[PDB]
Design a protein around this ligand. Structure first.
Ligand SMILES: *[C@@H]1O[C@H](CO)[C@@H](O[C@@H]2O[C@H](CO)[C@@H](O)[C@H](O)[C@H]2NC(C)=O)[C@H](O)[C@H]1NC(C)=O
Ligand SMILES: *[C@@H]1O[C@H](CO)[C@@H](O[C@@H]2O[C@H](CO)[C@@H](O)[C@H](O)[C@H]2NC(C)=O)[C@H](O)[C@H]1NC(C)=O
Ligand SMILES: *[C@@H]1O[C@H](CO)[C@@H](O[C@@H]2O[C@H](CO)[C@@H](O)[C@H](O)[C@H]2NC(C)=O)[C@H](O)[C@H]1NC(C)=O
Ligand SMILES: *[C@@H]1O[C@H](CO)[C@@H](O)[C@H](O)[C@H]1NC(C)=O
Ligand SMILES: *[C@@H]1O[C@H](CO)[C@@H](O)[C@H](O)[C@H]1NC(C)=O
Ligand SMILES: *[C@@H]1O[C@H](CO)[C@@H](O)[C@H](O)[C@H]1NC(C)=O
Ligand SMILES: *[C@@H]1O[C@H](CO)[C@@H](O)[C@H](O)[C@H]1NC(C)=O
Ligand SMILES: *[C@@H]1O[C@H](CO)[C@@H](O)[C@H](O)[C@H]1NC(C)=O
Ligand SMILES: *[C@@H]1O[C@H](CO)[C@@H](O)[C@H](O)[C@H]1NC(C)=O
Ligand SMILES: *[C@@H]1O[C@H](CO)[C@@H](O)[C@H](O)[C@H]1NC(C)=O
Ligand SMILES: *[C@@H]1O[C@H](CO)[C@@H](O)[C@H](O)[C@H]1NC(C)=O
Ligand SMILES: *[C@@H]1O[C@H](CO)[C@@H](O)[C@H](O)[C@H]1NC(C)=O
Ligand SMILES: *[C@@H]1O[C@H](CO)[C@@H](O)[C@H](O)[C@H]1NC(C)=O
Ligand SMILES: *[C@@H]1O[C@H](CO)[C@@H](O)[C@H](O)[C@H]1NC(C)=O
Lengths: 401, 115, 186
């Protein structure tokens, strides 16, 4: 049975969106020549098809961001008085001094990470920071009630008592250890702050991949593909149209193949980005707006609560978990035999320190006398395997006598 | 001269021997912002990535030059997305504004009170 | 688009095989036939690739729908915002062309009220905690109620359990706890 606990805070990084790029098919293949355009018009709707695929990919990113970050009806503000029971939320709460209202940890996260056009996102960084601040203020002030309707206020210590109940530990354990829990939370947050300033590789991998794909696409414009030269102006200046067409056709074929490869791999990347964004939205719904019973979904340990922070093209979750510590050996029995009848524990386990028998809760050592109030009777002592002999106390009799 | 992508970035004049940089002429897409055909027949035109001077009410955004829409300094819910926090709506002419995330609420937090 | 791509030259002199055969001798004709073949093969391959990419998304959506059928219709889910918005009660499926429709029934609370609250009650040098619920006060009296609905009740030894003294807990308030056994005894 554990005799002590630890408060653990850990981070998780998930990509959400990627860069929105567009390529004009005619400009890349031909540039500004009319002969090449007239020759390219005989190939059908390849250019219209390629442009529509890229437009769909670009449109999907805004939906990706909206599904993850726009999950609150209202923009909640934190109260001016920060009386949260000893818990300190300052590295994750906004500071007005910075021109952007990004928090300290958000600043640390943001400091780390031919027919071509790059399109700006619909939502700016300030709007995403405001979304995260509203989510975090709602979580601090109203618990999980604002997810399912209107925000109902509650003191923070009582919310933590509810969250301790949610993992099988009683409320008096929280209420008789409040200062230690607050200190442990503060120290863990400080350790995250130190570790970050001293990580985000998943967010940089996407940027590297996209940049490398664009570089390959641009560099493929200097290949001859069998023509006398890779420059179209030289071909048009040095040759008559009937002899120029046979070279321009080879150039067109090569450049079409290059654009089609690029678009296909871009679609395949966009699918994975969408899956990651869906996972991030599920985590936002289930870890931040509630308390999850799923094992290893929100952190490592027994989940208590999570806090979201915005990252460039991503999101960071800080998971707070409960970790038992300092276990101790005991001897246990399934039941107790008293007056020829068998007693079972209501919501605990029978333990022995070597001479006496007690009943305690499963996740924390807190022995108590075995009475009829915390046990129930079923049958007799013959059936059970491993029953032991002991006395069960009846509180009513001494009071009556 | 050549850039990273091996294009003729710079040239030397033969007659006077001076180095002149070569930069491409402006290009970009054209987007049309329209209400329903029943509602009205007037439109706004956005030149993406193009400075307003290069174009042959004029309002400059991070997305590009917007022609035909008047900027109002109020905020509403987004109707038609333009980009970089700007939306457009028909209210009669087309207006452009900065979108609002939602209503502002302050919870009555205290260390004694519950709802 | 696939059907319409059959009227393109792809560099040849005509898009009709019969016209090419009639207007040209075989040795020159095969050169145009090869161009047409290459173009049409490329069109077919593009169609097949996009069909595969779309089928992957359809499969992901179908997997999500199957999970929702298992967890919202055949049970009650505690996952937040998975089966509707609110506290999930039950769901009913309907069939749609190439799809499925879920009708989610949820529970939404309303009409909240101010109250004063305390973590514990101090009585006879003992600290009492609520077994299941929260201590509330209307201004003069103290009750215990369940968390998601207001139903005040008298604080007794049957709603609370004792753990320790009154010195440790921050915010403990003095009040009385009624013992039901004593009136029956006397
Ligand atoms: C449970 O663990 C905590 C943290 O290790 C213990 O609190 C520390 O105890 C040591 C030893 O007395 C003190 O020097 C520290 O000042 C305490 N606080 C911290 C933050 O380290 C606590 O004593 C343990 N519980 C029991 C019953 O031993
Ligand atoms: C096991 O628990 C029992 C019960 O608390 C312990 O017995 C107590 O020992 C202390 C001194 O250590 C005495 O002051 C108490 O009067 C004892 N209680 C009773 C009911 O006799 C016992 O010491 C613990 N350890 C072992 C090895 O038995
Ligand atoms: C808080 O609730 C208590 C319990 O209902 C109220 O006390 C009762 O008030 C009514 C109103 O006149 C009286 O008829 C009862 O006799 C009172 N009961 C007792 C046991 O005294 C109390 O008035 C409420 N307080 C406020 C401020 O509304
Ligand atoms: C929270 O911690 C910071 C140090 O990171 C400290 O400056 C601040 O005073 C603490 N909050 C309160 C309310 O003391
Ligand atoms: C419990 O017993 C095992 C086996 O005798 C021993 O290895 C261990 O050190 C004991 N103590 C704890 C805290 O597990
Ligand atoms: C545990 O196993 C041992 C055999 O090594 C046996 O003697 C003992 O009775 C068993 N315990 C119970 C409670 O039956
Ligand atoms: C428990 O008590 C009963 C009744 O006195 C007795 O028959 C039984 O043998 C006892 N158990 C053991 C293990 O001695
Ligand atoms: C002729 O070209 C030379 C460069 O070799 C230049 O220095 C000179 O000024 C030019 N003369 C005229 C008349 O343009
Ligand atoms: C155009 O808008 C009007 C609104 O008065 C609406 O009644 C009408 O149905 C719309 N047009 C079409 C084709 O639906
Ligand atoms: C357009 O040109 C003016 C004049 O140089 C400049 O001040 C402005 O920043 C340009 N527009 C953008 C979007 O950079
Ligand atoms: C924009 O803000 C300025 C601030 O001085 C104000 O005068 C102006 O009226 C605002 N724009 C509109 C369309 O009202
Ligand atoms: C609780 O009291 C505050 C005090 O200002 C009030 O604003 C709030 O509306 C109250 N909550 C209710 C009535 O649900
Ligand atoms: C609430 O805060 C006030 C002011 O610091 C304090 O006097 C009171 O004891 C606190 N109550 C609780 C339950 O923490
Ligand atoms: C509760 O009563 C005790 C003695 O009965 C007293 O010392 C203490 O101050 C009281 N608490 C309050 C908050 O008045």
């Amino acid at each position: 049975i554990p005799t002590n606990f630890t408060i653990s805070v850990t981070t998780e990084i998930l990509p959400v969106s990627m860069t929105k790029t567009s390529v004009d098919c005619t400009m890349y293949i031909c540039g500004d020549s009319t002969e090449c355009s007239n020759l390219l018009l005989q190939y059908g709707s390849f250019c219209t098809q390629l442009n529509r695929a890229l437009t769909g990919i670009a449109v999907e990113q805004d939906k990706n961001t909206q599904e993850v970050f726009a999950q609150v009806k209202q923009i909640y503000k934190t109260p001016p008085i920060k009386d949260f029971g000893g818990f300190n939320f300052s590295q994750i709460l906004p500071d007005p001094s910075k021109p952007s209202k990004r928090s300290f940890i958000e600043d640390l996260l943001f400091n780390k990470v031919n027919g071509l056009t790059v399109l700006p996102p619909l939502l700016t960084d300030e709007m995403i920071a405001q979304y995260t601040s509203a989510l975090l203020a709602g979580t601090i002030t109203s618990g999980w009630t604002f997810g399912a309707g209107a925000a109902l206020q509650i003191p923070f210590a009582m919310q933590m008592a509810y969250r301790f109940n949610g993992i099988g530990v009683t409320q008096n354990v929280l209420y008789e250890n409040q200062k230690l829990i607050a200190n442990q939370f503060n120290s863990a947050i400080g350790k995250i702050q130190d570790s970050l300033s001293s990580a985000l590789g998943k967010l940089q991998d996407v940027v590297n991949q996209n940049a490398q794909a664009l570089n390959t696409l641009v560099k493929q414009l200097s290949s001859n593909f069998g023509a006398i030269s890779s420059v179209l102006n030289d071909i048009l200046s040095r040759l008559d149209p009937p002899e120029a067409e046979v070279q321009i056709d080879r150039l067109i074929t090569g450049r079409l193949q290059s654009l089609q490869t690029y678009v296909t791999q871009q679609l395949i990347r966009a699918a994975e980005i969408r899956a990651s964004a869906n996972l991030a939205a599920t985590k936002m719904s289930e870890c931040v707006l509630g308390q999850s019973k799923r094992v290893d979904f929100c952190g490592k340990g027994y989940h208590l609560m999570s806090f979201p922070q915005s990252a460039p093209h991503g999101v960071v979750f800080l998971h707070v978990t409960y970790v038992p510590a300092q276990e101790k050996n005991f001897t246990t029995a399934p039941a107790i035999c008293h007056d020829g009848k068998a007693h079972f524990p209501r919501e605990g386990v029978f333990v022995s320190n070597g001479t006496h028998w007690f009943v305690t809760q499963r996740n924390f050592y807190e022995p108590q006398i075995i009475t009829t109030d915390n046990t129930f009777v079923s049958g007799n002592c013959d059936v059970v395997i491993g029953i032991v002999n002991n006395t069960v106390y009846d509180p009513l009799q001494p009071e009556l006598d | 001269g050549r850039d990273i992508a091996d294009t003729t970035d710079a040239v030397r004049d033969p007659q006077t021997l001076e180095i002149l940089d070569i930069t491409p002429c402006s290009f970009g897409g054209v987007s049309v912002i329209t209400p329903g055909t029943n509602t009205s027949n007037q439109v706004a035109v956005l030149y993406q990535g193009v400075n307003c001077t290069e174009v042959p009410n004029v309002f400059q955004t991070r997305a590009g030059c917007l022609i035909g829409a008047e900027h109002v300094n109020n905020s509403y819910e987004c109707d038609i997305p333009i980009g970089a926090g700007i939306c457009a709506s028909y209210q009669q002419s087309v207006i452009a504004y900065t979108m609002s995330l939602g209503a502002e609420n302050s919870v009555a937090y205290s260390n004694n009170s519950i709802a």
